[PDB]
């Protein structure tokens, strides 16, 4: 049992409520929440022992609401989101008030926009290995491109014959901006998957590139002509060429 | 207050170094964390005194002299990330961990047999789209970013079974022959003749 | 040279009164305690605050944790209660009493648990409000408590003082007399 | 009588000799009974009675917790002592002595509690009754030294030279 936090990512507009879920390790009474920013600074928000709140800062008492009901998951909720609330929210549990060791959840990356107008899902495309590469190295490398999305809240994975792979893979350290000038720019992300030449040539093999976009939830109002840009999965497929 | 150094560190595979945290007051204990690329904090250590050794890592804490050190030996790519120490002061009214500024640790991959090349690949759903792939260079090479064309940052992949790593970068928009110019691709960079 | 000393961090939570205490002492005299409800640090001697601070909020959290442990404890004995222990009371001057010389009268309540007491100063048989000092419940080597009450007084042949001390173990308020 | 419930804890920093020999002793009382001790000379929790056994079992199976308590001899005790060493440890309040008809010696308004009291030419090693040391509660001591024969000298850490009668 590790600490659990959902959702991984969270986009919201000024004025909305932002709500995060944490499940502490089994048998840990003490629970903490922090914010971490992009300059790697951490701020403590609130303390819990069991159901009860022990410590919290001025801000949180004023703008936030939090609970840890027994045998249920912990939660924190910003009442009226502001742009300044954008941060990685982290949850940690300890076994004992008197002892420092803390274990952290995966966090929730919260982004607070002025509104959700510019939120878009990715498009995804798999590109096939150049022939030269095969002749030259006897290795085949698939590229995968995700374009046009916003915000950069995406997780990308490779699937081979229904299974998920981690060997031979690497993804860009982070989504790049399509047009740096714009305050609101759409993003792009590439990833590579490399396999032996022979393996790619067998046509029985199926290569899929999956992209978990994180956008609006059904709790988010959508008043626009286009489709709702909702949390989803956009994918691309390719088969071995002999 | 927690001063942590160094700020950033680059390490060749299989080499080592140390991080340090100096405290301006008595700490109850210290913890070290690695925040990885997915941003998850991994517990490396808890200690209230002495020195502890765990795998390729070791850590010393001294409350009275008021410092903690973290040693990384024989670095591996998986070690890349941002490292933090975290302590509660014994005088602190709020039970909360205070964090060091963090060290961003970069592990540089060891390429034994560079084979630099810029290949081109075609969209598998249609022949309309193509991207350029710069691959198999060694780590001396850095990749650069005009407005119509985008170049991704380099990343390293491990075909772990096959005992083989390779660097790559991606450009897309123009001819692969121009996407990565000679700023800066190794002289012997293979450009196939499509 | 030898420096034999003892510092104590003493804290408790009491039910059903819902009262708590967090204090430090040095060799048996209080250095400070925390006003739980006001959440601040009350230094026993004024001069102390110039050599040391303490972050009250820590005490509050400690009390809350005590309260939660109490609940754990009750359930483990099955809400099984215990007998009260009666205060030994004593009254005395702070210095040699001199007629027409200002002095302090000390009510010393000792060896009592629980740490809750009603204590009243009586000048000539009537309750006194002004010039009274109270001292939080102080620790002892054992499991019992002690407490000091202090009233300012002026030595006179006519005046006669009493300490009325009410506790749950006592069958009724024990009073203690003090005339010049 | 009236039923009550006390959770009482004392965390005693014992200094045998300033920071040369420091013992941390954390004592747990439920009601009127001490049930649990942590003694830094032992390094573990020991139940004093059945009512404490579950706490010792819960707690001693938390290794990092035991590791933290042991270090508290340094993180709290030793730390606090270096502060108190500036004002509490060297606190010197000079005594006032007054003698009144058994013969009465009055020693009052002094700190610390360490005091030497004795009484023609040679002090009477017999027939002496005392009030013991009396703790005022405001960081001063007072005591009464009495001689029952039909000059008193006082030695104290605040006085280079003894005080007489």
């Amino acid at each position: 049992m590790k600490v659990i936090q959902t959702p991984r990512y969270l986009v919201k507009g000024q004025g909305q409520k932002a709500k995060m879920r944490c499940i502490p390790e089994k048998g840990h009474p003490v629970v903490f929440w922090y914010q971490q920013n992009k300059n790697n600074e951490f701020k403590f928000l609130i303390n819990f022992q069991n159901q009860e709140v022990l410590q919290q800062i001025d801000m949180t008492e004023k703008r936030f609401s939090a609970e840890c009901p027994s045998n249920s998951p912990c939660s924190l909720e910003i009442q009226s989101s502001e742009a300044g609330d954008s941060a990685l929210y982290l949850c940690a549990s300890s076994l004992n008030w008197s002892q420092d060791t803390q274990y952290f959840g995966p966090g929730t990356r919260l982004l607070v926009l002025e509104d959700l107008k510019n939120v878009f899902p990715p498009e995804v495309a798999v590109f096939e290995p150049s022939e030269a590469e095969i002749s030259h190295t006897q290795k085949a490398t698939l590229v995968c491109l995700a374009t046009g999305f916003y915000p950069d809240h995406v997780e990308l994975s490779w699937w081979v014959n229904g299974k998920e792979v981690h060997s031979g893979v690497c993804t860009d350290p982070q989504p790049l901006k399509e047009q740096p000038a714009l305050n609101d720019s759409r993003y792009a992300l590439s990833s590579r998957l490399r396999v032996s030449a022979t393996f790619w040539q067998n046509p029985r093999n199926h290569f899929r590139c999956q992209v978990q976009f994180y956008g609006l939830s059904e709790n988010d109002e959508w008043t626009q002509d286009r489709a709702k840009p909702v949390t989803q999965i956009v994918s691309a497929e390719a088969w071995g060429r002999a | 207050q927690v001063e942590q150094s160094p700020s950033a560190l680059s390490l060749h595979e299989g080499t080592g170094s140390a991080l340090r945290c100096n405290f301006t007051t008595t700490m109850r204990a210290v913890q070290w964390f690695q925040q990885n690329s997915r941003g998850s904090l991994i517990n490396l250590f808890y200690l209230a005194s002495g020195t502890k050794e765990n795998g390729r890592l070791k850590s010393t804490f001294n409350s009275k002299e008021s410092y903690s050190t973290l040693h990384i030996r024989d670095a591996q790519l998986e070690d890349s990330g941002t490292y933090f120490c975290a302590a509660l002061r014994a005088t602190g009214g709020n039970n909360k961990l205070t964090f060091g500024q963090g060290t961003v640790l970069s592990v540089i991959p060891d390429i034994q047999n560079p084979d630099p090349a810029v290949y081109q690949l075609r969209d598998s759903k249609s022949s309309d789209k193509s991207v350029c792939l710069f691959t198999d260079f060694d780590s001396q090479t850095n990749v650069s970013q005009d407005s119509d064309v985008y170049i991704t940052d380099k990343c390293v992949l491990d075909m772990r079974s096959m005992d083989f790593k390779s660097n790559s970068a991606v450009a897309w928009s123009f001819a692969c022959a121009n996407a990565f110019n000679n700023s800066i691709i190794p002289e012997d960079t293979f450009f196939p003749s499509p | 040279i030898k420096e034999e000393h003892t510092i104590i961090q003493a804290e408790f939570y009491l039910l059903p009164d819902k009262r708590g205490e967090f204090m430090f002492d040095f060799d048996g005299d209080e250095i400070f305690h925390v006003d739980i409800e006001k959440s601040e640090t009350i230094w026993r001697l004024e001069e102390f605050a110039k050599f040391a601070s303490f972050e009250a909020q820590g005490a509050l959290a400690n009390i809350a944790v005590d309260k939660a442990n109490l609940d754990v404890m009750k359930e483990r004995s099955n809400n099984t209660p215990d007998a009260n222990v009666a205060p030994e009371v004593t009254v005395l001057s702070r210095s040699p009493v001199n007629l027409g010389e200002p002095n302090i009268l000390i009510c010393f309540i000792d060896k009592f648990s629980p740490p809750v007491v009603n204590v009243t100063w009586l000048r000539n048989g009537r309750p006194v409000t002004e010039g009274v000092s109270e001292t939080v419940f102080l620790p002892r080597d054992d499991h019992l408590f002690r407490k000091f009450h202090y009233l300012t007084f002026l030595p006179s042949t006519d005046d006669f003082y009493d300490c009325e001390v009410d506790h749950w173990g006592l069958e009724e308020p024990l009073r203690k007399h003090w005339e010049f | 009588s009236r039923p009550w419930f006390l959770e009482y804890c004392k965390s005693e920093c014992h200094f045998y000799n300033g920071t040369q020999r420091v013992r941390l002793l954390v004592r747990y009382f439920y009601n009127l009974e001490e049930n649990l001790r942590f003694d830094s000379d032992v390094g573990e929790f020991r139940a004093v009675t059945e009512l404490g056994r579950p706490d010792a079992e819960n707690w001693n199976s938390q290794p990092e917790f035991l590791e933290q308590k042991r270090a508290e001899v340094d993180t709290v005790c030793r730390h606090n002592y270096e502060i108190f060493d500036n004002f509490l440890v060297p606190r010197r309040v000079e005594p006032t002595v007054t003698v009144y008809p058994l013969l009465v010696c009055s020693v009052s308004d002094f700190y610390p509690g360490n005091i030497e009291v004795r009484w023609n030419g040679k002090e009477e090693k017999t027939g002496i009754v005392s009030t013991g040391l009396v703790r005022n509660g405001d960081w001063t001591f007072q005591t009464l030294v009495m001689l029952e024969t039909v000059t008193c000298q006082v030695e104290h850490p605040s006085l280079t030279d003894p005080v007489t009668v």
Partner: peptide, 13 residues
């Protein structure tokens, strides 16, 4: 006016 240290109370249960 240096800050004074203390024990955090431990969790029973």
């Amino acid at each position: 006016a240096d800050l004074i240290a203390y024990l955090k109370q431990a969790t029973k249960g």
